[PDB]
Amino acid sequence: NNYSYIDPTQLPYDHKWEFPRNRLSFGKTLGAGAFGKVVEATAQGLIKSDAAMTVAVKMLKPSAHSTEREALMSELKVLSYLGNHENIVNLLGACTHGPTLVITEYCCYGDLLNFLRRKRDEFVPYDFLTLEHLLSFSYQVAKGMAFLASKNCIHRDLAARNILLTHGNITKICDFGLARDIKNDSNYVDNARLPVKWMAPESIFNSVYTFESDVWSYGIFLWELFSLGSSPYPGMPVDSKFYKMIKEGFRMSSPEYAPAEMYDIMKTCWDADPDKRPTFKQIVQDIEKQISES
Numbered sequence: 001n002n003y004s005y006i007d008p009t010q011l012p013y014d015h016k017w018e019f020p021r022n023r024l025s026f027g028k029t030l031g032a033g034a035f036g037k038v039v040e041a042t043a044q045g046l047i048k049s050d051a052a053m054t055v056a057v058k059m060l061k062p063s064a065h066s067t068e069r070e071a072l073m074s075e076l077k078v079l080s081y082l083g084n085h086e087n088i089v090n091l092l093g094a095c096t097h098g099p100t101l102v103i104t105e106y107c108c109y110g111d112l113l114n115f116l117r118r119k120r121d122e123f124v125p126y127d128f129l130t131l132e133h134l135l136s137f138s139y140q141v142a143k144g145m146a147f148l149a150s151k152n153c154i155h156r157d158l159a160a161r162n163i164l165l166t167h168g169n170i171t172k173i174c175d176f177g178l179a180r181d182i183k184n185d186s187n188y189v190d191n192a193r194l195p196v197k198w199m200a201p202e203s204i205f206n207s208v209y210t211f212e213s214d215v216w217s218y219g220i221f222l223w224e225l226f227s228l229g230s231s232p233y234p235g236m237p238v239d240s241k242f243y244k245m246i247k248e249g250f251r252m253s254s255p256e257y258a259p260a261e262m263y264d265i266m267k268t269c270w271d272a273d274p275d276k277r278p279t280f281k282q283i284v285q286d287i288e289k290q291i292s293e294s
């Protein structure tokens with residue numbers, strides 16, 4: 001035991017992140033749920049001493065159990081360990097001296113799923129959404145996930161709803177509440193509500209999460225993207241028949257606007273054998289070549 005994997009959630013909270021609570025002014029709620037809410041806010045003096053900036057602030061309800069408080073702190077420590085990357089919603093600060101507040105970047109265009117549904121009607125393959133945009137988004141998300149995988153981290157809730165868009169058509173992966181550093185055991189074994197239609201079969205049937213199950217979810221994200229924000233497995237409810245069809249190899253067909261090479265990636269992401277799925281590193285190089293040929 002002279003060498004070990006450093007567990008990022010065991011490391012101390014770095015007080016370089018600490019920011020005064022009184023310098024945040026809370027605005028409109030950006031997301032809400034059982035644990036708490038994410039709210040838009042103006043932070044005075046966060047980056048430059050005399051300037052206010054718009055941030056997103058994640059917070060728990062007062063009623064949350066101390067285990068929920070630990071999970072928010074673990075997320076904070078995971079983001080601190082990961083460091084900065086262009087394609088992830090980056091940590092900006094925290095308030096840990098009343099309730100724990102986690103301050104991240106504010107993405108002005110919101111989640112990609114609603115963005116696609118807004119732009120669906122005016123989409124043209126060739127300020128309109130185009131096929132070039134969709135290729136860039138697929139590429140940027142794969143870069144972000146490749147970065148996560150290189151840090152021995154799995155996200156576990158990859159989907160268009162958890163991809164945010166900000167200035168410059170930059171996509172950022174958000175919501176790291178379920179992310180895990182799996183360096184030690186090569187997978188993660190998880191009773192909350194789960195995103196069944198984005199989950200690999202091994203995650204549904206045996207509660208196993210890996211690099212490869214993140215790649216499955218990325219395939220579903222691609223289908224969301226090139227169908228311009230449609231719900232996956234349309235007209236199929238989550239029931240006994242859904243699980244049986246997935247187990248027996250049923251897969252979604254190519255969305256209307258997906259290039260053949262992109263649906264090829266989707267199919268490999270959805271292989272029943274996790275070993276046969278590609279890595280995010282391989283996906284990035286594939287999409288690179290596709291972009292290079294217009």
Ligand SMILES: COC(=O)N[C@@](C)(c1ccc(F)cc1)c1cnc(N2CCN(c3ncnn4cc(-c5cnn(C)c5)cc34)CC2)nc1
Nearest residue numbers: 030031032033034035036037038056059060106107110174
């Ligand atoms: C069981 O599930 C839970 O309880 N989870 C929640 C409720 C939770 C909350 C607190 C907590 F402690 C634990 C969990 C939760 C809720 N929401 C979110 N997301 C995180 C990323 N978001 C944004 N981040 C940065 N900028 N930004 C801009 C926009 C935007 C929208 N419209 N426009 C024009 C712009 C949106 C964002 C959106 C909300 N995450 C988690």
